[PDB]
């Protein structure tokens, strides 16, 4: 709506802040192994995926556009990251075999986006 602060400053300065948060969200660890292999109606999707995900992604996709100047703005990046998270959060329970390998990425990147100033204000 209005009164926000997710532009930070420049698209390139964002590629930088995106790097550190890339190390967090994308630490090449087991926590980030299943994130790039989510579920979708095109392949063994799950019941009702338009209210809990609508447009899911794979950590490898947002990464193919992250290193480039495609999703340097936290608005677009945080949009896919957050959705890519909600894609595996709105129905991953709180302690089952789905809300865990991604909960470490949500807690480690949510701390790297503030630095990215997407959460600046």
């Amino acid at each position: 709506g209005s009164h926000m602060r997710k532009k930070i400053f420049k698209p390139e300065e964002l590629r930088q802040a995106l790097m550190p948060t890339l190390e967090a969200l994308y630490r090449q660890d087991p926590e980030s192994l299943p994130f790039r292999q989510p579920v979708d109606p095109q392949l063994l999707g799950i019941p009702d995926y338009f209210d809990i995900v609508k447009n899911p992604m794979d950590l490898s996709t947002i990464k193919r556009k992250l290193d480039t100047g495609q999703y340097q703005e936290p608005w677009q990046y945080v949009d896919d990251v957050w959705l890519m998270f909600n894609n595996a959060w709105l129905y991953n329970r709180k302690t089952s075999r789905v809300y865990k390998f991604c909960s470490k990425l949500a807690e480690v990147f949510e701390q790297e986006i503030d630095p990215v100033m997407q959460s600046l204000g």
Partner: peptide
């Protein structure tokens, strides 16, 4: 039975990827 008999769809308890 030989042919289907009032079957229709069946949720069969399916909770997304938190089980399969």
């Amino acid at each position: 039975s030989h042919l289907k008999s009032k079957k229709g769809q069946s949720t069969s308890r399916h909770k997304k990827l938190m089980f399969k």
